[PDB]
């Protein structure tokens, strides 16, 4: 229900935090208790022993699978592709942003969309996600109804694709989900338990699906490097402000994801 | 208001007539069959499609004359044919002048080995024979089409005579004769409406055909194929006839997850094209009588059956969808080999099969009937082309009858099927896994219905859609339910009153009233019942403010109907037209007259008073006359006696007496509320009358 | 009054029935559709050996 | 005979109520109420659009099927089915208010 | 399909005086419709086909239905014409 | 005595000689207006006043 305060009266940490990381950063590291001692640093900061955690993942095609979060504040590290922009943006929004949805099953069923916020996600070792339009007495356009291979591709093999089609008509699917899943996805809204911080060059980042809005907005961050140990020190020593620019989890409970606090 | 069904119910007896139309053009043929010897049962046409060149039928008593029926190809000169007729070989000299149709020679030897003559020569497009032995006469065609009638001959033995069909067959009952000339005369009629449209053994004993919903959601791919028809034609070969579409039938075997699904299905197209290579009328050219070809235009049918857990529970249908996929049917390509020179190629062929909805359908089996599933289907063309070679058509688009398995020992079809259906329970479990009194129900139900609830409910007027939704069953009768309803009503007896008042105030533009009216049809009791019982026509003729009685009988109908459910889906015409006449016989109507008030019963009580201290005032015919012929009428649905009763009992208000005698709705249910016994009384005693 | 055409709009509904069974029954008794050759025979290379 | 081109994908839901909600501007009023006394019907729908063709035609019956499934028919249908269990007497439980 | 036309307009023309005139206003009291229009016709034969829909199809080009589609298009065309200046008289 | 109510929530009721307003329940309203012959009301009593 709606609330009731006051704005002539003015007013005079514990939770988890979570570091991922990619693994060149920790070849390059040539240590075993860097964890110890970043951990000594937190504690310094006065934030409890344990209170941190750390995990670490190959490389961005395979951490796109189904990512976990499992602190009540995130922040992932993320490299620079040379030509990898467009899946370093798909994590961005998946990531980003809060997907309430449901599963498909492309085999049995025709689909669609039906709102600017609707989206189709493909996630899995590899994808080659091909769709075929529809007409009002189910009839292709430029595509025949019985062969894969004449369809129209997104996507070949990909590790995840956030694939955008017009709404309003519905389409045939081609993958085989003896390798992958699929998701009908809606964009319930912004999803604050993550910062993005890039390490490196030029921020690519576009976290919608239209070219009239490009928003920077205060979480998806840049910072340069030729040595991790300065970018740790910069995480850790600016970590007020990482944590002022983000804030809570918002919505209610997605599928029962694993969720860590000691 | 309450009312107004009725006329609704009595509107559209025009569009009824269509759908008995569409049910007369809806409305079959029995077979065909694998060939047997039997004896013609009594009173029965043997209809006969005819393909194989040469004879079809052998007929003996074994004693008296012996028939036969021989079809023969055009273009064939003075030639000695062979052929097995009536069990034996025998040479007979045919040629067939003909070279635009086919010729039918009837085949007679009046004895066994005596001499056998040619008679009834046809000249046949339609290719189609019929006979009949029966009613102790001989009834063979004779006459080209559309002259084909039929010629009858005589010989003992009408009642035991083996018929020998080398060609398939149809059973049809004597009353349809008109369509089985229509049939012979006009062609074959589609293959769809059929009711042992696969070939198959002559096996006829099969089935032919509270709640609970349950629904069905489950996978199949269909497996199905084209059956095809080559029937070569005269000369040396030098000339094809047809090759046409039979329908086929097919079984299969696959996984459901680990439940293993055996299933049998059968195709049939429907509206196929006939081109043609017409060569010269030389005897020794390649000509085509006809190539089968199908056009987006036409139709194709599967018709699905298996057994299972699920599938078997289909009879009592509520809803059937279908979200099936569509699939390509590449062709193959016919070889010819002519006697002499390069063989031609029938090469290519391509379409596509794509959904357009479903319903259900009563296959056959080699032994039993199956509750099987139709799904109809339309057509798409594709790029590869159709192309006929070393001849004179390229840039075809279809589907032709060359190869259509092209090899594939099937086409698939994988998609989903989605089924509503009804199982009686007796209560909320026992689910089971496969498949006059009423008067006296509504009569007993009928002593619970509340007063005030019933007026309301008489206030909102009950129309055509807002009268059924209250009961939903099978989807295939309800297609015609408001449909049957009017079916009976337009041959209401009411309906019939209405025709007499409409004919007889026709006949009066060329009694009682200062004036010849229609309406003016101890003897005053007999005048006043004459008019009452007559006057029931105006409500039903919309001349009525407040409510009429006939109000109330569409409302207690209405929650009859809801009620109870004992009742059949396919019974409720009977119910409404019966409580549209029977119900409510002691009524009585009052119209007014600038403080001149009348009520007449149909009983024979008649009334006449005052406005304000409703005195007893003597009853003048001749006013009754002049004031009843047009200004509107008023349902009493409180008489005179009520009324006089209420006065003496409680104080009443100008407004109240004022509205009472024009018996708005409002002042009623406010008396009701009110608790007082006496309008409870006249609404019950009302009410409990409705009997049936 | 004008509002007619909503109340109406469910009036008359049954008769879309009719039409899906006339879309149905329509699609069952199809007539086979003929072609008739035109002004011109065609009689090219003979039979030749 | 020809390979047969395809049809034309009617305009989206969306847009269609854009451009809808656009035509509001020059909507005169006391035409409008002229109007809106004058009852309409069936053939005064649909004689007015390319005034007379068999082009569509039926095009009244495709509005009845869409039209049957929209809410307003539940919504009559579900008042109906609400009077006439109060007719039936209705076991005025706890819930009803 | 003209001539039965004419011969019924001679019919109609001398049974225009040997008609009543009070009954006459007293039938235009009561309703009619499809059905009590031509479905008490002494005419009993069977093809009694849809008397109303066969009527229907002449009727819906007769000009009185023209001109109602007329009537409703002006009443349209009022509705819309701001940003034109009234053009009508 | 005049009983207006919509669906934004607003109801008033009022004489129909001079419009001022004598207090409303919503009893006699509904006892009134399940029967009552209803006009809709175009000129609302905000409009109307």
């Not at chain 1, 993005?196 to 809005?213: E, H, N, W």
């Not at chain 2, 009858?152 to 004597?174: E, G, L």
Request: aromatic letters at 10%; glycine letters at 4%.
């Amino acid at each position: 229900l709606p609330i009731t305060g006051s704005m002539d009266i003015a007013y005079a940490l514990t939770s988890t935090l979570c570091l991922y990381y990619p693994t060149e950063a920790a070849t390059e590291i040539n240590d075993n208790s860097w964890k110890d001692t970043l951990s000594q640093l937190f504690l310094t900061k006065g934030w409890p022993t344990g209170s941190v955690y750390f995990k670490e993942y190959t490389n961005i095609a395979s951490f796109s699978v189904d990512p976990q979060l499992y602190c009540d504040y995130n922040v992932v590290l993320m490299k620079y592709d040379a030509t990898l922009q467009l899946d370093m943006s798909e994590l961005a929004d998946l990531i980003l942003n809060e997907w309430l949805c449901n599963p498909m099953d492309i085999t049995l069923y025709y689909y669609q969309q039906t709102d600017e916020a609707n989206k189709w996600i493909s996630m899995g070792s590899s994808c080659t996600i091909k769709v075929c339009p529809l007409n009002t007495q189910t009839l292709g356009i430029g595509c025949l109804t019985t062969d894969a291979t004449t369809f129209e591709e997104v996507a070949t093999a990909e590790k995840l694709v956030i694939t955008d089609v017009v709404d309003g008509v519905n389409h045939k699917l081609d993958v085989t989900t003896a390798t992958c899943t699929i998701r009908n996805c809606k964009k319930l809204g912004p999803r604050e338990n993550v910062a993005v911080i890039q390490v490196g060059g030029s921020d690519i980042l576009d976290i919608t699906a239209d070219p009239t809005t490009a928003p920077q907005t205060e979480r998806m961050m840049r910072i340069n490097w030729k040595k991790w140990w300065q970018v740790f020190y910069t995480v850790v020593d600016y970590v007020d402000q990482i944590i002022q620019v983000m804030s809570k989890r918002s919505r209610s409970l997605n599928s029962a994801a694993f969720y860590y606090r000691v | 208001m309450a009312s107004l069904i009725y006329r609704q119910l009595l509107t559209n007896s025009y569009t009824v007539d269509l759908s008995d139309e569409i049910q007369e053009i809806g409305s079959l043929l029995d077979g065909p069959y694998q060939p047997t010897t039997f004896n013609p049962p009594v009173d029965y046409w043997m209809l006969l499609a005819p393909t194989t060149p040469g004879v079809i039928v052998e007929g003996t008593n074994n004693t008296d004359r012996w028939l036969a029926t021989i079809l023969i190809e055009p273009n064939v000169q003075s030639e000695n044919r062979t052929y097995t007729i009536f069990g034996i070989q025998e040479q007979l000299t045919v040629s067939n002048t003909s070279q635009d149709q086919w010729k039918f020679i009837d085949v007679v030897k009046t004895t066994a080995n005596g001499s056998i003559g040619q008679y009834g020569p046809l000249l046949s497009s339609p290719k189609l024979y019929a006979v009949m032995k029966h009613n102790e006469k001989l009834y063979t065609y004779e006459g080209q089409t559309p002259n084909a009638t039929t010629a009858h001959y005589s010989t003992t033995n009408y009642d035991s005579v083996n018929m020998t069909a080398f060609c398939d067959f149809y059973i049809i009952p004597r009353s349809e004769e008109s369509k089985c000339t229509e049939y012979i005369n006009n062609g074959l009629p589609p293959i769809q409406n059929t009711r042992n449209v696969v070939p198959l053994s002559l096996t006829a004993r099969d089935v032919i055909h509270l709640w609970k919903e349950m629904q069905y959601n489950r996978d199949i791919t269909i497996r199905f194929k084209f059956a095809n028809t080559i029937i070569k034609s005269g000369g040396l070969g030098y000339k094809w006839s047809e090759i046409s579409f039979k329908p086929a039938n097919y079984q299969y075997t696959y996984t459901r997850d680990g439940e293993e699904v055996t299933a049998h299905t059968t195709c049939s197209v429907n509206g196929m094209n006939d081109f043609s290579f017409n060569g010269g009328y030389l005897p020794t050219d390649f000509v085509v009588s006809k190539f089968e070809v199908i056009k987006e235009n036409s139709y194709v049918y599967i018709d699905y059956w298996d057994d299972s857990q699920a599938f078997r529970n289909v009879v009592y249908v509520r809803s059937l969808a279908a979200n099936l996929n569509s699939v390509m049917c590449t062709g193959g390509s016919y070889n010819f080999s002519l006697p002499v020179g390069q063989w031609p190629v029938l090469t290519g062929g391509a379409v596509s099969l794509h959904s357009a909805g479903v319903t259900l359908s009563t296959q056959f089996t080699d032994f039993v009937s199956l509750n099987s599933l139709r799904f109809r289907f339309r057509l798409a063309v594709e790029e590869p082309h159709f192309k006929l070679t070393r001849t004179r058509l390229d840039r075809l688009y279809g589907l032709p009858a060359a190869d259509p398995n092209n090899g594939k020992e099937y086409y698939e079809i994988a998609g989903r099927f989605s089924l509503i259906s009804l199982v009686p329970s007796n209560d909320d479990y026992q689910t089971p896994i496969a498949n006059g009194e009423l008067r006296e129900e509504f009569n007993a139900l009928s002593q619970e219905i509340a007063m005030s609830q019933l007026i309301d409910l008489a206030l909102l007027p009950l129309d055509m859609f807002s009268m059924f939704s209250g009961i939903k069953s099978t989807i295939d009768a309800a297609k015609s339910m408001a449909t049957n309803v009017m079916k009976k009503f337009k041959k209401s007896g009411l309906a019939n009153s209405v025709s007499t008042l409409t004919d007889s105030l026709s006949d009066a533009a060329s009694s009682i009233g200062s004036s010849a009216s229609a309406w003016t049809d101890s003897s005053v009791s007999t005048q006043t019942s004459t008019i009452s019982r007559r006057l029931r026509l105006k409500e039903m003729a919309t001349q009525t403010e407040g409510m009429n009685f006939d109000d109330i009988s569409a409302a207690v109908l209405k929650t009859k109907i809801d009620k109870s459910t004992q009742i059949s889906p396919n019974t409720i015409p009977d119910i409404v037209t019966e409580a549209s006449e029977k119900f409510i016989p002691n009524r009585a109507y009052r119209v007014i007259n600038n403080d001149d008030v009348f009520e007449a019963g149909i009983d024979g009580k008649f009334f006449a008073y005052k406005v304000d201290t409703f005195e007893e005032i003597p009853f003048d015919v001749q006013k009754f006359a002049d004031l009843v012929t047009d200004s509107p009428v008023i349902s009493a649905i409180i008489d005179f006696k009520t009324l006089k009763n209420l006065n003496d009992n409680y104080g009443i208000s100008r407004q109240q007496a004022f509205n009472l005698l024009r018996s708005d709705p409002r002042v009623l249910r406010e008396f009701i509320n009110q608790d007082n016994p006496i309008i409870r009384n006249r609404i019950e005693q009302l009410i409990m009358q409705c009997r049936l | 009054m004008a509002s007619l055409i909503y109340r109406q709009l469910l009036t008359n509904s049954y008769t879309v029935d009719l039409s899906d069974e006339i879309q149905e029954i329509g699609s069952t008794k199809s007539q086979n559709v003929t072609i008739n050759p035109g002004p011109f025979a065609q009689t090219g290379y003979a039979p030749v050996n | 005979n020809s390979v047969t081109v395809r049809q034309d994908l009617e305009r989206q839901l969306g847009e269609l109520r854009e451009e809808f909600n656009a035509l509001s501007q020059e909507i005169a009023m006391s035409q409008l109420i002229d109007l809106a006394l004058l009852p309409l019907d069936m053939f005064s729908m649909f004689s007015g659009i390319k005034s007379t063709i068999d082009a569509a035609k039926s095009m009244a019956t495709n509005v009845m099927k869409k039209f049957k499934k929209s809410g307003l028919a539940n919504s009559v249908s579900t008042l109906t089915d609400s009077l006439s269990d109060a007719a039936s007497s209705i076991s005025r439980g706890s819930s009803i208010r």
